[PDB]
Write the structure tokens for this entry.
Amino acid sequence: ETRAHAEERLLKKLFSGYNKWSRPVANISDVVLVRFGLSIAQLID
Amino acid sequence: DTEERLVEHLLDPSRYNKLIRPATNGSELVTVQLMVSLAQLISVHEREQIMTTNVWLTQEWEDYRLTWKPEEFDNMKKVRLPSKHIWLPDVVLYNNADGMYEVSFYSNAVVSYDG
């Protein structure tokens, strides 16, 4: 009933049959969207 | 979905191996077509006799154990794969200094149904 135990169960069920290189998309014709941004920490040189 | 099953069918360690290179009909040579593309000559440290270049080298080769029936898999043509898992013919400089030999990024590779 502890929170970490349920989180571990989530992490256990989530990685059951998941692959990495498989581009995750519903239909082959469908695309993905990558929102992209930068932040300048410091300008070294 | 079908892409994942395709990858699991091709990238089977029990069925596909990485350390051996493909060859048929009495160890026939596997033609490897490579060509270079110069991005920009970034510097020439003439004092140390070192030339620093940005290079895109393209490599093509035929491989037969990677084929699959394209009709069954929703008529897919090309699939992306990681480089660290499929075999690859090593191509690296000799007159290279700095100790660095291999490429930096190890990109994904395109694979067609022909092989």
Summary: Chain B has one helix and four strands. Chain B touches chain A through twelve residues (CB under 8 Å).
